[PDB]
Amino acid sequence: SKARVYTEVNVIRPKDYWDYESLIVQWGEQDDYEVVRKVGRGKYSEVFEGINVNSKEKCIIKILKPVKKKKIRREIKILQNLCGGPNIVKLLDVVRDQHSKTPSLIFEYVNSTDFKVLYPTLTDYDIRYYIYELLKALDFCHSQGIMHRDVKPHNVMIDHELRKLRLIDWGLAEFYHPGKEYNVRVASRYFKGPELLVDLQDYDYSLDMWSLGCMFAGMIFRKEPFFYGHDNQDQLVKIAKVLGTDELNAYLNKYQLELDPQLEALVGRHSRKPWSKFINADNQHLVSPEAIDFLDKLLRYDHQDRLTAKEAMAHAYFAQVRAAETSRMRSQAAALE
């Protein structure tokens, strides 16, 4: 298997671009940034709100807990390659405790609510807008040869007042090289794609589109998580109880995969359920025909058959969002002129 798009990015660009393990980190002055208060509760790192000592502009400080030195360089290299991209969190500096070399990542300040806490309050239209803005980030990083591999509500930070969205936490992100077999121990359980659950290791950018589909389903159907598995095996069961096992078997047969008998026993056999099954009077206002067609084209076993980020942005579901952005920019230009 090879990606349908952006296949050759890392063949066109030089070794220095994707060879993170050889990264030369020009660290900054740790003294330039002062921590203010803790925030994050994670096992990979600790997050603090901070300030630049001089400019006094706020910032986010992410101290990377003990991890393979290679995981530190991977996250920094990816953040550097994506720096400046649409809706990518902006890495401003990297410093380290100059006696233990414990790295800290300095990001732009993110005055945001978490997607998980925000979307229950959002209108149909604002869900389209923020999904669209998230697609902009994913198309950009895919176009730069990078898979995020941990798309989920916690990693989407939104300042709803300013309508700004940022895709954060690039600690699991990886460079896409065609033909390469990757570790499947990525993404969070509820957002893991079937490829991870059946051990299809030569996956690609389309993994992120499955995860986006899971988020989207949970939002428009007001069911969080949409696929609520109790472990990685049950996660595939929960998917198969919606998408059906015929399409699963066709997918396994196409990529010459076999499930362990223990897992096949749990999956059993299940009919495909129509997306309308999840519509109720309480989520009806979020589930248009266009939403279902869009969702149906994301949540497919076959990663090759899912929409790319670019194709997703072009779906009719975002027709009004696209018209708003076209109009906004044309007006901004005239105001400047």
Ligand X SMILES: O=P(O)(O)O[C@H]1[C@H](OP(=O)(O)O)[C@@H](OP(=O)(O)O)[C@H](OP(=O)(O)O)[C@@H](OP(=O)(O)O)[C@H]1OP(=O)(O)O
Binding site residue list for ATP: 39-47, 62
| Given 150, 169, 204, 208, the catalytic residue | 150
Q: How far apart are CA 119 and CA 128, in angstroms?
A: 11
Among 111, 183, 326, 327, binds ligand X (CB under 6 A): 183
Q: How many residues bind ligand X (CB under 6 A)?
A: 2
Q: Which does 183 bind (CB under 5 to 8 A by kind): ligand X, Cl ion, Na ion, none?
A: ligand X
Cβ contacts of residue 196 below 8 Å, gap of 6+?
184, 186, 187, 203, 207, 232
Kindly list the distances between the CA atom of residue 139 and the CA atoms of 50, 136, 155, in Å, as whole numbers in the listed order.
Answer: 30, 5, 16
Q: Which residues contact 73 (CB under 8 A, 6 or more apart)?
A: 20, 21, 23, 25
Longest dimension (CA), the chain: 67
Picked from Cl ion, ligand X, Na ion, none, the partner binding residue 110 (CB below 5 to 8 A depending on kind) is Na ion
| 19 belongs to the binding site for ligand X (CB under 6 A) | no
Site string for ligand X, 42-81 (x = CB under 6 A): --------------------------x-------------
Select 262 or 284, whichever has its Cβ closest to Na ion.
284
Judge whether 321 and 129 are in contact, CB under 8 Å. yes
Instruction: Tell which one of 45, 87, 104, 112 touches Na ion (CB under 5 A).
Output: 112
Are 312 and 303 spatial neighbours (Cβ–Cβ below 8 Å)? Answer: no
Q: Does 308 bind Cl ion (CB under 5 A)?
A: yes
Placement of tokens 């919606």 in the chain: 242
Peptide bond into 14 cis (omega under 30): no
Q: Which two tokens stand for residue 154?
A: 């916690």
- 150 among known catalytic residues: yes
Q: And the tokens for 313?
A: 């942005």
Q: Note the Cα 207 to chain centre separation in Å.
A: 9
> Stretches 128-136, 158-166, 213-221, 259-267: which one binds Cl ion (CB under 5 A)?
213-221
Nearer to ligand X, 184 or 295 (CB): 184
CB of 282 to Na ion, least distance (A): 5
Sign for the pseudo-dihedral over CA of 135, 136, 137, 143: positive
Determine the interface stretch with Na ion among 66-74, 124-132, 213-221, 284-292 (rule: CB under 5 A): 284-292
Active site residues: 150
Contact residues toward ligand X (CB under 6 A) are 68, 183
Which residues form the interface with Na ion (CB under 5 A)? Answer: 108-110, 112, 194-195, 284-285, 303
Judged by the rule CB under 5 A, the positions of this chain that interact with Cl ion are: 205-206, 214, 227, 308
